[PDB]
């Protein structure tokens, strides 16, 4: 990857010692938290920050975080996109506080549901919506409904996708081109040959061959892959994807949980896509677990004919999906504030300007140092990969990842006051990001890479 | 069932008209919400309230709800248990408001995690914990870990269980005693013979026969069934369940999402159960979607052996579970307030007094009217079933449910100011419930049943 791995290891060890010295109270907290949390924090992913323990946060506002050791950071991680529009957005926090004090969960709608339903249809261009407690659940539930409406059992996913804890998606290609369980993800009692057809992104011939079996209920995809580094769609890919799925009467599900970085209507709105289903989680409810999903009228009519509107006196049933706290008053209040006050054209304009600045800086560093790496931007979200050219598909991209180099870069920045999400080589801008914060990122990355070379 | 169904239909039709007359603004709202929500509200379950639409809530506090028509209710539904300790509990709402203003989701712990971890271990008597965004997810993720640690693929569940949108649980017995997909729940590409063994509750011989195949990773159960009416465990059943699962090296997962009504440490802490895993969602975070799960020391050691603590520089992986907003700062603040200030001995004592009063009142009415029905209480939660004696198992219980009678009783009460969850024949008390609220329930139920007889 253009670096001396011994120099990376040397720097990394020094930065691990620096991390211990700078964050003693977080380290003390980790010793205590390891006594009662299975993985030393409430979520096992939190163990995967670089450094010997996760930081404990004292407070955060906008793009600023302060830890319990008093260290201050500019935050480009933003809750791994859960806080994409910044921490503690005042309209959203105010809406959450107000609604909590007048009922958070009633198993009933409020007036905010009226506003949000109409907003979702206006913004995202599909008429009918539902709310879940996570993007994962939106994907699971849409796939169930697609199986119900179509009578077909298989879902197409793309190699090196991520759609959450959707077990049918947890597959990869092995060296022989066979679909096998994703590395490190147990098959969990699923035989994926019965549930899933796997294809590489940007391969219309392979997609045709998969759909032609006649057993595919849906294609589930990001419109631009973001969970193996960034994989842009090739020229003509979306048009082909849309055409093939129409021809084979296969649902096209577009998951914008990350690609909502592209604009206020997502990638789909910015590029004229025509999804059958649209999924969006992570960032829309101020840090309350939530997602929305939407569908076309044509899909809605097929769903209603296999799951009719409930009749008076009918036997109660969940029908295998929904959730007790899904679509609750608190979620809807937070969503209303987010869509009305936060996810605006002006907000995105600012985010794009700062993200473009960050992208240009990374690119200049990669060019100057002659690294065989590249950087990509989708709106507010910027990521680099350790290969010379943009990947054609997820399988290609996967080879351009490295745990040690990633940990070293991330920790060097962390110890000097910049947080990057540990799961990506990405930076995300929000309305509170300032030009100085981008300059600090840029300088620190350049310093780190220069020390390595 | 001891009622003439034509008389029930007649009363129900009258109450449907009454509902329309009393709630015109909610009906107007429904017409609009059906344009933008697939099932006319954010969550499709909300269509299953009786009456021609779900009520739109204006505000709620404690056990009091006011709708957008200005109608006032006493609430024994409490968000279908999501608001078990009342609406707008002041310490929990204050904690949510405060935390929203200082960072709600950071992909990092806060100091609240220190207190909450220690509290969960103290309260529930298992040492190690994790947080999810729902009870469903806690169940799914525990089952994945049990498959990983055991190398076995099957889960045992009980007929007419409910554990959330856990696909492997969605089975029932047909008329021949064969395991088939649960009515109204599509198999979703699963062949359940490969994932699931089904037994009736309170049947140790059948349980032994299922475990003896050597292919069961776990038994998943409520300790007292609450989702088909109430099915108490028989004398000696828990002792047998614990012993058989030990003998077969099978994990016992106890789901307390409802049975937390039994007391501050759940049914398990009242009755000396020895769960390998303990799951609790719905009510612990003030209406923020959340759940916890805990495991024994012995299970922790087996999990760490298959999924070791993350190492610096290791390649990132979710391993198939967790979620982006799981274990977040906002959830932890709400849980801390709940466990510290809300789920107290005094709260439970109040809840039990009012629930015992409600139970005794229902029973007096059933006995006076000579209905072939019975009522059961587990702590704060009271439910009747349309059969003379407590059911021995879920299959028996399922025959003593009836959509039309249930809708009629629920609507009669709703139109006269008492909310009951539409999915059960249950009433739940909270610290804000008042004696007069119980008296109103008692009188209205007696009036309804008297009109029918």
mmCIF file with all atom_site columns, N, CA, C and O in Angstrom, chain A residues 251-282:
data_model
loop_
_atom_site.group_PDB
_atom_site.id
_atom_site.type_symbol
_atom_site.label_atom_id
_atom_site.label_alt_id
_atom_site.label_comp_id
_atom_site.label_asym_id
_atom_site.label_entity_id
_atom_site.label_seq_id
_atom_site.pdbx_PDB_ins_code
_atom_site.Cartn_x
_atom_site.Cartn_y
_atom_site.Cartn_z
_atom_site.occupancy
_atom_site.B_iso_or_equiv
_atom_site.pdbx_formal_charge
_atom_site.auth_seq_id
_atom_site.auth_comp_id
_atom_site.auth_asym_id
_atom_site.auth_atom_id
_atom_site.pdbx_PDB_model_num
ATOM 1   N N  . UNK A 1 251 ? -38.599 -6.200 -7.138  1.00 0.00 ? 251 UNK A N  1
ATOM 2   C CA . UNK A 1 251 ? -38.544 -4.943 -6.385  1.00 0.00 ? 251 UNK A CA 1
ATOM 3   C C  . UNK A 1 251 ? -37.137 -4.406 -6.295  1.00 0.00 ? 251 UNK A C  1
ATOM 4   O O  . UNK A 1 251 ? -36.218 -5.161 -5.974  1.00 0.00 ? 251 UNK A O  1
ATOM 5   N N  . UNK A 1 252 ? -36.986 -3.095 -6.474  1.00 0.00 ? 252 UNK A N  1
ATOM 6   C CA . UNK A 1 252 ? -35.706 -2.423 -6.333  1.00 0.00 ? 252 UNK A CA 1
ATOM 7   C C  . UNK A 1 252 ? -35.758 -1.609 -5.026  1.00 0.00 ? 252 UNK A C  1
ATOM 8   O O  . UNK A 1 252 ? -36.534 -0.625 -4.923  1.00 0.00 ? 252 UNK A O  1
ATOM 9   N N  . UNK A 1 253 ? -34.953 -2.035 -4.051  1.00 0.00 ? 253 UNK A N  1
ATOM 10  C CA . UNK A 1 253 ? -34.897 -1.381 -2.743  1.00 0.00 ? 253 UNK A CA 1
ATOM 11  C C  . UNK A 1 253 ? -33.595 -0.601 -2.664  1.00 0.00 ? 253 UNK A C  1
ATOM 12  O O  . UNK A 1 253 ? -32.497 -1.190 -2.736  1.00 0.00 ? 253 UNK A O  1
ATOM 13  N N  . UNK A 1 254 ? -33.731 0.725  -2.473  1.00 0.00 ? 254 UNK A N  1
ATOM 14  C CA . UNK A 1 254 ? -32.579 1.627  -2.422  1.00 0.00 ? 254 UNK A CA 1
ATOM 15  C C  . UNK A 1 254 ? -32.413 2.078  -0.967  1.00 0.00 ? 254 UNK A C  1
ATOM 16  O O  . UNK A 1 254 ? -33.295 2.706  -0.379  1.00 0.00 ? 254 UNK A O  1
ATOM 17  N N  . UNK A 1 255 ? -31.278 1.701  -0.381  1.00 0.00 ? 255 UNK A N  1
ATOM 18  C CA . UNK A 1 255 ? -30.918 1.969  1.010   1.00 0.00 ? 255 UNK A CA 1
ATOM 19  C C  . UNK A 1 255 ? -29.980 3.177  1.058   1.00 0.00 ? 255 UNK A C  1
ATOM 20  O O  . UNK A 1 255 ? -28.819 3.103  0.655   1.00 0.00 ? 255 UNK A O  1
ATOM 21  N N  . UNK A 1 256 ? -30.524 4.296  1.579   1.00 0.00 ? 256 UNK A N  1
ATOM 22  C CA . UNK A 1 256 ? -29.870 5.593  1.588   1.00 0.00 ? 256 UNK A CA 1
ATOM 23  C C  . UNK A 1 256 ? -29.365 5.982  2.961   1.00 0.00 ? 256 UNK A C  1
ATOM 24  O O  . UNK A 1 256 ? -29.063 7.152  3.241   1.00 0.00 ? 256 UNK A O  1
ATOM 25  N N  . UNK A 1 257 ? -29.240 4.984  3.838   1.00 0.00 ? 257 UNK A N  1
ATOM 26  C CA . UNK A 1 257 ? -28.814 5.274  5.222   1.00 0.00 ? 257 UNK A CA 1
ATOM 27  C C  . UNK A 1 257 ? -27.502 6.089  5.311   1.00 0.00 ? 257 UNK A C  1
ATOM 28  O O  . UNK A 1 257 ? -27.321 6.885  6.231   1.00 0.00 ? 257 UNK A O  1
ATOM 29  N N  . UNK A 1 258 ? -26.561 5.820  4.395   1.00 0.00 ? 258 UNK A N  1
ATOM 30  C CA . UNK A 1 258 ? -25.368 6.653  4.206   1.00 0.00 ? 258 UNK A CA 1
ATOM 31  C C  . UNK A 1 258 ? -25.466 7.634  3.066   1.00 0.00 ? 258 UNK A C  1
ATOM 32  O O  . UNK A 1 258 ? -24.962 8.766  3.194   1.00 0.00 ? 258 UNK A O  1
ATOM 33  N N  . UNK A 1 259 ? -26.023 7.242  1.930   1.00 0.00 ? 259 UNK A N  1
ATOM 34  C CA . UNK A 1 259 ? -26.030 8.089  0.737   1.00 0.00 ? 259 UNK A CA 1
ATOM 35  C C  . UNK A 1 259 ? -26.965 9.297  0.857   1.00 0.00 ? 259 UNK A C  1
ATOM 36  O O  . UNK A 1 259 ? -26.932 10.155 -0.029  1.00 0.00 ? 259 UNK A O  1
ATOM 37  N N  . UNK A 1 260 ? -27.699 9.390  1.981   1.00 0.00 ? 260 UNK A N  1
ATOM 38  C CA . UNK A 1 260 ? -28.372 10.637 2.339   1.00 0.00 ? 260 UNK A CA 1
ATOM 39  C C  . UNK A 1 260 ? -27.372 11.806 2.457   1.00 0.00 ? 260 UNK A C  1
ATOM 40  O O  . UNK A 1 260 ? -27.760 12.988 2.404   1.00 0.00 ? 260 UNK A O  1
ATOM 41  N N  . UNK A 1 261 ? -26.068 11.514 2.539   1.00 0.00 ? 261 UNK A N  1
ATOM 42  C CA . UNK A 1 261 ? -25.052 12.546 2.395   1.00 0.00 ? 261 UNK A CA 1
ATOM 43  C C  . UNK A 1 261 ? -25.094 13.311 1.072   1.00 0.00 ? 261 UNK A C  1
ATOM 44  O O  . UNK A 1 261 ? -24.529 14.419 0.998   1.00 0.00 ? 261 UNK A O  1
ATOM 45  N N  . UNK A 1 262 ? -25.724 12.742 0.036   1.00 0.00 ? 262 UNK A N  1
ATOM 46  C CA . UNK A 1 262 ? -25.718 13.326 -1.308  1.00 0.00 ? 262 UNK A CA 1
ATOM 47  C C  . UNK A 1 262 ? -26.615 14.532 -1.460  1.00 0.00 ? 262 UNK A C  1
ATOM 48  O O  . UNK A 1 262 ? -26.480 15.309 -2.420  1.00 0.00 ? 262 UNK A O  1
ATOM 49  N N  . UNK A 1 263 ? -27.585 14.700 -0.552  1.00 0.00 ? 263 UNK A N  1
ATOM 50  C CA . UNK A 1 263 ? -28.506 15.830 -0.660  1.00 0.00 ? 263 UNK A CA 1
ATOM 51  C C  . UNK A 1 263 ? -29.742 15.587 0.167   1.00 0.00 ? 263 UNK A C  1
ATOM 52  O O  . UNK A 1 263 ? -29.949 14.476 0.669   1.00 0.00 ? 263 UNK A O  1
ATOM 53  N N  . UNK A 1 264 ? -30.621 16.600 0.232   1.00 0.00 ? 264 UNK A N  1
ATOM 54  C CA . UNK A 1 264 ? -31.779 16.485 1.096   1.00 0.00 ? 264 UNK A CA 1
ATOM 55  C C  . UNK A 1 264 ? -32.807 15.438 0.660   1.00 0.00 ? 264 UNK A C  1
ATOM 56  O O  . UNK A 1 264 ? -33.656 15.045 1.463   1.00 0.00 ? 264 UNK A O  1
ATOM 57  N N  . UNK A 1 265 ? -32.737 14.987 -0.580  1.00 0.00 ? 265 UNK A N  1
ATOM 58  C CA . UNK A 1 265 ? -33.575 13.939 -1.137  1.00 0.00 ? 265 UNK A CA 1
ATOM 59  C C  . UNK A 1 265 ? -32.744 12.707 -1.461  1.00 0.00 ? 265 UNK A C  1
ATOM 60  O O  . UNK A 1 265 ? -33.178 11.850 -2.233  1.00 0.00 ? 265 UNK A O  1
ATOM 61  N N  . UNK A 1 266 ? -31.554 12.616 -0.875  1.00 0.00 ? 266 UNK A N  1
ATOM 62  C CA . UNK A 1 266 ? -30.692 11.485 -1.117  1.00 0.00 ? 266 UNK A CA 1
ATOM 63  C C  . UNK A 1 266 ? -30.070 11.462 -2.526  1.00 0.00 ? 266 UNK A C  1
ATOM 64  O O  . UNK A 1 266 ? -30.244 12.359 -3.349  1.00 0.00 ? 266 UNK A O  1
ATOM 65  N N  . UNK A 1 267 ? -29.291 10.422 -2.751  1.00 0.00 ? 267 UNK A N  1
ATOM 66  C CA . UNK A 1 267 ? -28.751 10.144 -4.073  1.00 0.00 ? 267 UNK A CA 1
ATOM 67  C C  . UNK A 1 267 ? -29.884 10.006 -5.086  1.00 0.00 ? 267 UNK A C  1
ATOM 68  O O  . UNK A 1 267 ? -29.795 10.502 -6.227  1.00 0.00 ? 267 UNK A O  1
ATOM 69  N N  . UNK A 1 268 ? -30.963 9.317  -4.664  1.00 0.00 ? 268 UNK A N  1
ATOM 70  C CA . UNK A 1 268 ? -32.093 9.049  -5.557  1.00 0.00 ? 268 UNK A CA 1
ATOM 71  C C  . UNK A 1 268 ? -32.692 10.335 -6.076  1.00 0.00 ? 268 UNK A C  1
ATOM 72  O O  . UNK A 1 268 ? -32.983 10.458 -7.257  1.00 0.00 ? 268 UNK A O  1
ATOM 73  N N  . UNK A 1 269 ? -32.875 11.317 -5.195  1.00 0.00 ? 269 UNK A N  1
ATOM 74  C CA . UNK A 1 269 ? -33.414 12.609 -5.628  1.00 0.00 ? 269 UNK A CA 1
ATOM 75  C C  . UNK A 1 269 ? -32.431 13.408 -6.480  1.00 0.00 ? 269 UNK A C  1
ATOM 76  O O  . UNK A 1 269 ? -32.855 14.038 -7.456  1.00 0.00 ? 269 UNK A O  1
ATOM 77  N N  . UNK A 1 270 ? -31.149 13.325 -6.158  1.00 0.00 ? 270 UNK A N  1
ATOM 78  C CA . UNK A 1 270 ? -30.134 14.099 -6.872  1.00 0.00 ? 270 UNK A CA 1
ATOM 79  C C  . UNK A 1 270 ? -29.892 13.554 -8.299  1.00 0.00 ? 270 UNK A C  1
ATOM 80  O O  . UNK A 1 270 ? -29.525 14.340 -9.158  1.00 0.00 ? 270 UNK A O  1
ATOM 81  N N  . UNK A 1 271 ? -30.115 12.252 -8.508  1.00 0.00 ? 271 UNK A N  1
ATOM 82  C CA . UNK A 1 271 ? -29.785 11.573 -9.767  1.00 0.00 ? 271 UNK A CA 1
ATOM 83  C C  . UNK A 1 271 ? -30.991 10.986 -10.471 1.00 0.00 ? 271 UNK A C  1
ATOM 84  O O  . UNK A 1 271 ? -30.827 10.219 -11.428 1.00 0.00 ? 271 UNK A O  1
ATOM 85  N N  . UNK A 1 272 ? -32.194 11.325 -10.025 1.00 0.00 ? 272 UNK A N  1
ATOM 86  C CA . UNK A 1 272 ? -33.388 10.847 -10.734 1.00 0.00 ? 272 UNK A CA 1
ATOM 87  C C  . UNK A 1 272 ? -33.633 9.351  -10.707 1.00 0.00 ? 272 UNK A C  1
ATOM 88  O O  . UNK A 1 272 ? -34.185 8.817  -11.656 1.00 0.00 ? 272 UNK A O  1
ATOM 89  N N  . UNK A 1 273 ? -33.272 8.674  -9.622  1.00 0.00 ? 273 UNK A N  1
ATOM 90  C CA . UNK A 1 273 ? -33.580 7.251  -9.529  1.00 0.00 ? 273 UNK A CA 1
ATOM 91  C C  . UNK A 1 273 ? -35.078 7.066  -9.285  1.00 0.00 ? 273 UNK A C  1
ATOM 92  O O  . UNK A 1 273 ? -35.771 7.992  -8.849  1.00 0.00 ? 273 UNK A O  1
ATOM 93  N N  . UNK A 1 274 ? -35.537 5.857  -9.547  1.00 0.00 ? 274 UNK A N  1
ATOM 94  C CA . UNK A 1 274 ? -36.945 5.471  -9.436  1.00 0.00 ? 274 UNK A CA 1
ATOM 95  C C  . UNK A 1 274 ? -37.067 4.204  -8.563  1.00 0.00 ? 274 UNK A C  1
ATOM 96  O O  . UNK A 1 274 ? -37.419 3.142  -9.042  1.00 0.00 ? 274 UNK A O  1
ATOM 97  N N  . UNK A 1 275 ? -36.787 4.331  -7.260  1.00 0.00 ? 275 UNK A N  1
ATOM 98  C CA . UNK A 1 275 ? -36.856 3.152  -6.352  1.00 0.00 ? 275 UNK A CA 1
ATOM 99  C C  . UNK A 1 275 ? -38.279 2.616  -6.258  1.00 0.00 ? 275 UNK A C  1
ATOM 100 O O  . UNK A 1 275 ? -39.218 3.389  -6.298  1.00 0.00 ? 275 UNK A O  1
ATOM 101 N N  . UNK A 1 276 ? -38.407 1.332  -6.061  1.00 0.00 ? 276 UNK A N  1
ATOM 102 C CA . UNK A 1 276 ? -39.691 0.756  -5.577  1.00 0.00 ? 276 UNK A CA 1
ATOM 103 C C  . UNK A 1 276 ? -39.893 0.941  -4.082  1.00 0.00 ? 276 UNK A C  1
ATOM 104 O O  . UNK A 1 276 ? -41.000 1.126  -3.630  1.00 0.00 ? 276 UNK A O  1
ATOM 105 N N  . UNK A 1 277 ? -38.799 0.777  -3.351  1.00 0.00 ? 277 UNK A N  1
ATOM 106 C CA . UNK A 1 277 ? -38.731 0.979  -1.913  1.00 0.00 ? 277 UNK A CA 1
ATOM 107 C C  . UNK A 1 277 ? -37.501 1.836  -1.612  1.00 0.00 ? 277 UNK A C  1
ATOM 108 O O  . UNK A 1 277 ? -36.480 1.706  -2.276  1.00 0.00 ? 277 UNK A O  1
ATOM 109 N N  . UNK A 1 278 ? -37.621 2.656  -0.572  1.00 0.00 ? 278 UNK A N  1
ATOM 110 C CA . UNK A 1 278 ? -36.559 3.576  -0.142  1.00 0.00 ? 278 UNK A CA 1
ATOM 111 C C  . UNK A 1 278 ? -36.410 3.401  1.360   1.00 0.00 ? 278 UNK A C  1
ATOM 112 O O  . UNK A 1 278 ? -37.413 3.447  2.088   1.00 0.00 ? 278 UNK A O  1
ATOM 113 N N  . UNK A 1 279 ? -35.193 3.178  1.828   1.00 0.00 ? 279 UNK A N  1
ATOM 114 C CA . UNK A 1 279 ? -34.908 2.992  3.249   1.00 0.00 ? 279 UNK A CA 1
ATOM 115 C C  . UNK A 1 279 ? -33.913 4.039  3.753   1.00 0.00 ? 279 UNK A C  1
ATOM 116 O O  . UNK A 1 279 ? -32.892 4.317  3.081   1.00 0.00 ? 279 UNK A O  1
ATOM 117 N N  . UNK A 1 280 ? -34.192 4.592  4.925   1.00 0.00 ? 280 UNK A N  1
ATOM 118 C CA . UNK A 1 280 ? -33.312 5.599  5.524   1.00 0.00 ? 280 UNK A CA 1
ATOM 119 C C  . UNK A 1 280 ? -33.318 5.545  7.035   1.00 0.00 ? 280 UNK A C  1
ATOM 120 O O  . UNK A 1 280 ? -34.360 5.808  7.642   1.00 0.00 ? 280 UNK A O  1
ATOM 121 N N  . UNK A 1 281 ? -32.209 5.111  7.635   1.00 0.00 ? 281 UNK A N  1
ATOM 122 C CA . UNK A 1 281 ? -32.068 5.154  9.072   1.00 0.00 ? 281 UNK A CA 1
ATOM 123 C C  . UNK A 1 281 ? -30.942 6.021  9.559   1.00 0.00 ? 281 UNK A C  1
ATOM 124 O O  . UNK A 1 281 ? -30.565 7.011  8.929   1.00 0.00 ? 281 UNK A O  1
ATOM 125 N N  . UNK A 1 282 ? -30.394 5.620  10.721  1.00 0.00 ? 282 UNK A N  1
ATOM 126 C CA . UNK A 1 282 ? -29.288 6.300  11.421  1.00 0.00 ? 282 UNK A CA 1
ATOM 127 C C  . UNK A 1 282 ? -29.626 7.707  11.960  1.00 0.00 ? 282 UNK A C  1
ATOM 128 O O  . UNK A 1 282 ? -29.611 7.922  13.146  1.00 0.00 ? 282 UNK A O  1
#
